[PDB]
From a paper:
Insulin is a 51-amino-acid protein hormone with two disulfide-linked chains (A1–A21 and B1–B30) that is responsible for the maintenance of metabolic homeostasis, with an impact on cell proliferation and regulation of ageing. It exerts its functions through binding as a monomer to the tyrosine kinase-type IR, which is an (αβ)2 heterotetramer in which each individual αβ extracellular chain comprises L1, CR, L2, FnIII-1, FnIII-2 and FnIII-3 domains. Therefore, we undertook further mutagenesis-driven studies of insulin, focusing on the TyrB26 site that we assumed might be the critical structural pivot of insulin conformational activation on its receptor.
In the cases of [PheB26]-insulin and [GlyB26]-insulin, we aimed to investigate the structural consequences of the loss of the TyrB26 side-chain hydroxyl group or the whole TyrB26 side chain, respectively. Loss of chirality at the [name] site (GlyB26 mutant) and replacement of the phenolic Tyr side chain by a polar Gln and Asp (GlnB26 and AspB26 mutants) did not have a detrimental, or a major, effect on the affinities of these two types of analogues (∼70, ∼77 and 89%, respectively). The most important feature of these analogues is the occurrence of the B25–B30 bend that detaches this part of the B-chain from the insulin core. In consequence, insulin site 1-related A-chain side chains are fully revealed. It seems that the B24–B25 peptide bond in [AsnB26]- and [GlyB26]-insulins serves as a ‘rotation axis’ for the B25–B30 chain, sweeping it almost 180° away from its wild-type direction. The [AsnB26]- and [GlyB26]-insulin structures show high similarity up to [name] Cα (only ∼0.3 Å between these atoms), but the B27–B30 chains proceed in opposite directions in these analogues. This is likely to result from the lack of conformational restraints of [name] glycine, as the crystal packings in both analogues are virtually identical. The dimerization properties of [GlyB26]-insulin were not determined in this work, but it can supposed that they will be significantly lower than that of native insulin. Comparison of the [GlyB26]- and [AsnB26]-insulin structures with the previously reported high-affinity [name]-turn-containing truncated insulins suggests that the direction of the B-chain in the [name]-shortened analogues may vary without having a large detrimental effect on their IR affinity. In summary, the [AsnB26]- and [GlyB26]-insulin analogues are the first naturally substituted insulins with a stable conformation that differs from that in all known structures of the native hormone.
Numbering used by the authors:
A (entry chain A): 1 to 21
B (entry chain B): 2 to 29
Write the structure that this text describes.
């Protein structure tokens, strides 16, 4: 999920934007 | 430079890009 995608690896803006709502 | 969003950098970042739509659900 997010923490893996954005903290362990690196996440593009649009990766990051899809955990919104 | 360090590319990883961890902790409150990950939070501070969702607050930014989500905008009014937000995240972690909406009340109700």
């Amino acid at each position: 999920g997010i923490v893996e995608q954005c903290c362990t690896s690196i996440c593009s803006l649009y990766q990051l934007e899809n955990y919104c709502n | 430079v360090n590319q990883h969003l961890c902790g409150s950098h990950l939070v501070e970042a969702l607050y930014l890009v989500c905008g009014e739509r937000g995240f972690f659900g909406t009340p109700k």
